[PDB]
Amino acid sequence: PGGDMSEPVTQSTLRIVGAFWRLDASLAFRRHFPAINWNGSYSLFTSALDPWYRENVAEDYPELRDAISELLQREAGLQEIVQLVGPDALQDAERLVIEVGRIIREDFLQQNAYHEVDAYCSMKKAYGIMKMILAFYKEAEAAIKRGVSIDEILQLPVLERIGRARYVSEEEFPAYFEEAMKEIQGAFKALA
Amino acid sequence: PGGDMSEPVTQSTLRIVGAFWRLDASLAFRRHFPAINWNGSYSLFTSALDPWYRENVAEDYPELRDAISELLQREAGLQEIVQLVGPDALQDAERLVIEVGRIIREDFLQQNAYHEVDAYCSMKKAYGIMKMILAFYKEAEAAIKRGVSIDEILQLPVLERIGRARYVSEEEFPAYFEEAMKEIQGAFKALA
Amino acid sequence: MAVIADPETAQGFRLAGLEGYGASSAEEAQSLLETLVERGGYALVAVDEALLPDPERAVERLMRGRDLPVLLPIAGLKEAFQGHDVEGYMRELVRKTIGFDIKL
Amino acid sequence: VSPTRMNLLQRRGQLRLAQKGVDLLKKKRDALVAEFFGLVREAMEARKALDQAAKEAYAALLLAQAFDGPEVVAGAALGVPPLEGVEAEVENVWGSKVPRLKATFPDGALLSPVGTPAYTLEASRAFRRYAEALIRVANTETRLKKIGEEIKKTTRRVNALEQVV
Amino acid sequence: RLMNNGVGKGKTREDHKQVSDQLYSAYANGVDIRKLVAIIGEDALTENDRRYLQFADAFERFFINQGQQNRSIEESLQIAWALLSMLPQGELKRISKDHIGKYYGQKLEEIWG
Amino acid sequence: RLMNNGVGKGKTREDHKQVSDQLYSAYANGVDIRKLVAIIGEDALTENDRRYLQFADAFERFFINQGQQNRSIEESLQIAWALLSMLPQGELKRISKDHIGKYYGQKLEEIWGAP
Amino acid sequence: RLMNNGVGKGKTREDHKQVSDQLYSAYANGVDIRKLVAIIGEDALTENDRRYLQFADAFERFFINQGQQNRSIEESLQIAWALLSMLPQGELKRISKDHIGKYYGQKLEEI
């Protein structure tokens, strides 16, 4: 009642369930769906499900998931400073984290329920998307370590492939991902 | 609960007690004992108690007490500018008041409960220490106004005796006090 | 570049490739420095302290938004023999800057 | 604000962030003060060297106009062309870009390399070093005044928080 | 909630849904940038930030404020596209390429002066 | 709250209390610097600050994050001293000189030389 | 609220009401000048703001801070006139023009 997460039914439910998926209004206003609050949700089933993932998705699925979780947490930590000084006052090493958090948010988390192909997403598709986001981020951090400005990194046109990947069909996806990985590699090794 | 003086118990108490002795952990963190904060504390019995002081301690005890309170007040009202730039960057008068404030709160306020002589102190002993410090500060103010640097002053030998006056017994204190006053007088002539 | 100073030093500035001139008054200096900073093909102009101590009060209105021409007070012809009180200047500077008189 | 327990928690979190922002701003301002005082010393040093370099050029121009021809000096003035290659490099100072002067200043290839003037020939050399001292003083004082502006900015922000928010 | 039952092809127009949510995204951005200006001042902004600020303002003053006139749906979508054309074509990330190609680029002065 | 009455010689190794206090102070400083270095950048930090930064990082990666290991008290004090060895001697203003002479200088060997 | 009935001609001295109003108004802007100088620099100053800060301080130190003494109405009014007299005319745009000359002379020198 009243969006109040402290009423007795919600609390009585917290102490029983295994996972907890918290919806927030601010995302729903933005028309950004599913609108799952990341900071307030949890799950107690991950560690017990890791053998299944290693055997059925990919041998390093748990590590990719953990790296994405760590990046989201670090960006959440930076948001506190972004709020009091403005986002242009950060160093480039942190603007990069802010931008990759924005990318993770609007290119991986978001999902179109009325689209004909984005409605259902297999798990190897999610693996591929996570893998190429992390590859891009690692390369971009390396390139910042070499004096490249944060602005031309945001203009690299492989971000279009990354942001469009989720609209590719489940049978058309492996070829797309194999092309995109080497295109990402070339986005930085070729500039030198 | 968490140190908030606004709860009803504390408010109900402070309306009917006559004195508040504010112990504080930040002082015992920097090795100040007893850890009574001299800024938040207060009392309401001083005016009523003045006659007994004049007749049993000394005819000027109240004025020395107010003078020490005033030195501490000024030294407190000066700390922010000391935090901003540091002690060495200040004037000669501000340096002098910082030094004399340190001397007060390290040779008069501070008291060692386990020392078999500093565990207790009379009223006349405390009056003697206050008078010693006020005399020294008057001399030093005259000197730096005259043209001596605070550095000759900080290394004066009379300091290690004005700061050692706590651990003298209650019988050997009148003699120690009179000869220390004569020494304070002497070191000034060398400044004249 | 440009310097608003005594024409006898102005020729020396010309020897240093720097056009200079002057007429020994604050008002005329402020008048023609308007053109000088409008015809500001250089990045810095100098003015003695005796013409007017602070060029900011003068060019601040016309240099608004623009930063290239830096303006500073420079020793004068009296200082050519006497000198200057450097530390008093720095100290009255830090006074207004960090709020108080320090480093004493 | 709608009064709910959830709102109370949110506001308390806001208060905590406000205090933990105030202290961070304070640390930044302390670093700025350290940098500023480190600059003030070299600033007054450049001012010192400029003062001791102005006397030299002044004295060299003095007798060159009187004890040499009172006209050869103006002839040298009309002789040498002006200098304009004073293109500046924009410079980063704590999240801001300020001008830094890199005047090219050619000396040797100009007209009349050696010739007749007796004291003028060398008095023209002194104003070179006078200009260098000028540009050093300018380059240090622009940075000093910039850092000062940043300090007053941050203290304004700290006061804003601690007194209103 | 029932909005998706009655829009789209075979109904109002095929670009209705995507125009709607693109407007939502751009307006949300404008409002957040207002919240930032309230702290770091308008001069400190970038260029795309000023474009979003301008979008929010013109949106409020031309698309919301109609005042007793009766607008058909085509007029409404026309105004929406004229307002969307302020943003760079590469930022309309919720609209497809063809709808962009055949509706982008109208100016507000043309609909009315 | 009772910690002080259960440590020291005869109960544990006698450097326990001061090592505890020193670890606390170092971690606090590291966290504050880690926040500031986002708006200043590491290049504008003094040297002791970069020391504290690296210390806090290694602290939460070797001391806290221990996994399912069963550490004795001696292994824990070893790791604490090997972490404190990052800061320059003389910065450890809580500890007394005897213990600093006795245990300083070790480097991270065991936590990566063993599981 | 009931002040306007109890003061003035025949009840107190004649100038009481206008003196009180001008005193309030003069203390009002001194405080806000002190508020603006508190954040922006005191470099951006004018000639009369100095007058007003000085007035605010002498006010708080002589008019308000009366210690334990017992002041009759006449000498309170005299102290108030003394504190006003260190502001030029035209700044005293609230008092009428006859006693603005009748009482303006004496300055704070009497303590």
Numbering used by the authors:
A (entry chain A), B (entry chain B): 387 to 578
C (entry chain H): 1 to 104
D (entry chain G): 4 to 168
E (entry chain F): 360 to 472
F (entry chain D): 360 to 474
G (entry chain E): 360 to 470
What does the paper say about this structure?
V/A-ATPase is a motor protein that shares a common rotary catalytic mechanism with FoF1 ATP synthase. The V1 domain of Tth V/A-ATPase (A3B3D1F1) is an ATP-driven rotary motor where the central DF shaft rotates inside the hexameric A3B3 containing three catalytic sites, each composed of an AB dimer. When powered by ATP hydrolysis, the V1 domain rotates the central rotor against the A3B3 hexamer, composed of three catalytic AB dimers adopting different conformations (ABopen, ABsemi, and ABclosed). Here, we report the atomic models of 18 catalytic intermediates of the V1 domain of V/A-ATPase under different reaction conditions, determined by single particle cryo-EM.
The nucleotide-free V/A-ATPase (Nucfree) was used for cryo-grid preparation under different ATPase reaction conditions. We obtained structures of three rotational states of V/A-ATPase without nucleotide; state1 at 3.1 Å, state 2 at 4.7 Å, and state 3 at 6.3 Å resolution, with the DF shaft positions differing by 120° in each case. In the ABclosed and ABsemi dimers, densities for the catalytic side chains are well resolved, but no density corresponding to nucleotide was observed. Hereafter we refer to the structure as the Vnucfree. The structure of Vnucfree is very similar to the previously reported ADP inhibited structure. In addition, the Vnucfree is also similar to the structures under the saturated-ATP condition determined in this study, with the positions of the catalytic side chains almost identical in both cases. The Vnucfree in the ground state is activated by the binding of ATP to the catalytic sites.
